[PDB]
Ligand binder design. Sequence first.
Ligand SMILES: Cc1cc2nc3c(=O)[nH]c(=O)nc-3n(C[C@H](O)[C@H](O)[C@H](O)COP(=O)(O)OP(=O)(O)OC[C@H]3O[C@@H](n4cnc5c(N)ncnc54)[C@H](O)[C@@H]3O)c2cc1C
Ligand SMILES: C[C@]12CC[C@H](O)CC1=CC[C@@H]1[C@@H]2CC[C@]2(C)C(=O)CC[C@@H]12
Length: 501
Amino acid sequence: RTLADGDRVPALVIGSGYGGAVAALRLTQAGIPTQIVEMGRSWDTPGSDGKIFCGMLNPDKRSMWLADKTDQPVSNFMGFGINKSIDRYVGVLDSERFSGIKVYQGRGVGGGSLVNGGMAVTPKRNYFEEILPSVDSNEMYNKYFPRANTGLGVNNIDQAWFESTEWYKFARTGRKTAQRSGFTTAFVPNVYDFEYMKKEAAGQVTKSGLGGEVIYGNNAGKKSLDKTYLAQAAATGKLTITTLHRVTKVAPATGSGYSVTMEQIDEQGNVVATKVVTADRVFFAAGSVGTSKLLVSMKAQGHLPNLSSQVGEGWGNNGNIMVGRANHMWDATGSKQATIPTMGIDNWADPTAPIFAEIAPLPAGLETYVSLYLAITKNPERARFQFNSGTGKVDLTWAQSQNQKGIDMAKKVFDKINQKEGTIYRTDLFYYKTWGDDFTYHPLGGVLLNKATDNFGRLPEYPGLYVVDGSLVPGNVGVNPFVTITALAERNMDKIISSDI
Ligand SMILES: Cc1cc2nc3c(=O)[nH]c(=O)nc-3n(C[C@H](O)[C@H](O)[C@H](O)COP(=O)(O)OP(=O)(O)OC[C@H]3O[C@@H](n4cnc5c(N)ncnc54)[C@H](O)[C@@H]3O)c2cc1C
Ligand SMILES: C[C@]12CC[C@H](O)CC1=CC[C@@H]1[C@@H]2CC[C@]2(C)C(=O)CC[C@@H]12
């Protein structure tokens, strides 16, 4: 059963996304009874319509975390994406507003794996060696990265099927125009079962990726963490998952261990109870934003006053920038679009315009002629979290203007394709904005490896406290982050379990 006030637990993992799922798997396999505390719900119970998740075409209360309206980056575009009113509910996608950026995050058992596009990319070794020089890259490349990819269930699309299917016409068009401008394109591996997708196209199985589902969950096909790491962790019989509990405070307990305060909420987000449990070891896996907010609050409120001054520093947005281009009539993108991106434009090696851009679907169900892109740029800008005395809240200092360096990098590539194709940008996808620069899907940093923590995620001032999630990464990895977070967690857990436990 779930955690009760007064309980004493060997290992408590806060959060159940990538870092938390790796921690839980490795701890329980080591034979350590482990409690995961997750603020969202378990997504294994059908809603009204008999399905677990809602699709993007007709979202309902299941879409958003405690909100009165849906929120998608593309709004009111040709019948698609219009924000509708919903009941407040513990829905799957949180659009967390800070002053200069909104951070999209998954909420529920599996964290971001529930809502993400499944793109599983291993960073370039050269860049990896440069941004994380304290990490033994041989171990990462010979062992931890492969371990992560295999554990996550990464697979590749059948390229012959890709070429023929109407569902990926948008990607073929995006590839064609990138290549005509001299840019390199690459297939991108994914945790979505591509064999299942072929059956979807054949009309043989329930459509998910071919049925307008992704950011509010996938009823089928996508290997979210509850199907991989967490299923394996639960299989040991040593895992307990406590859902609908938000951790609010961590402080040294008397005698040993740490007191963990949590708010139990009902499905409407009302706090129904407050509990305190004592844990010998605590693994922060609440995500780049969640972990940073917790540690910054704990330090500023005098609960963990000895934390490093580096706590809260070095947050980045993985240089996320979105943009859409108009194609001419002969470069249709298709009325049937898979929701799972499979193709990227890799220009990272170009020091003048270092970007990796995925060709994203805009599944509106009609021909829009739009090529949509999500670009990861090598934006050097960073921000920090800081506790605000007046409000009792943690603020993020990121300013929207800090995205300008990323836009300039992206522009260099997209302007070149626009010149070759004689096309213009769309300005109606995001308030007459061309560049989608006020949100990120990829928050990274805040509690940097070997800066705020030791070289393995330990908080040295408080033995037994560990950080295992995206807050460790220095703001940008040059590709979709989850494979990196998983592999880094794999590395750290290996050392912690072998050294500390
Ligand atoms: C819409 C979307 C699309 C994306 N697409 C891709 C993609 O295709 N490929 C890729 O590599 N990455 C992608 N990402 C990013 C990827 O999902 C994240 O990098 C990744 O999930 C971060 O892992 P994490 O373990 O750090 O934290 P998360 O996965 O964010 O998990 C944090 C967990 O902790 C829980 N939590 C938070 N605070 C508390 C608290 N105080 N108490 C209890 N529980 C708490 C949260 O509810 C959540 O379940 C995308 C993200 C989104 C949101
Ligand atoms: C690119 C991304 C977000 C990144 C994911 O990995 C894949 C993905 C699929 C559908 C896209 C979404 C961005 C926002 C979009 C464009 C919408 O608003 C509806 C469809 C959505």
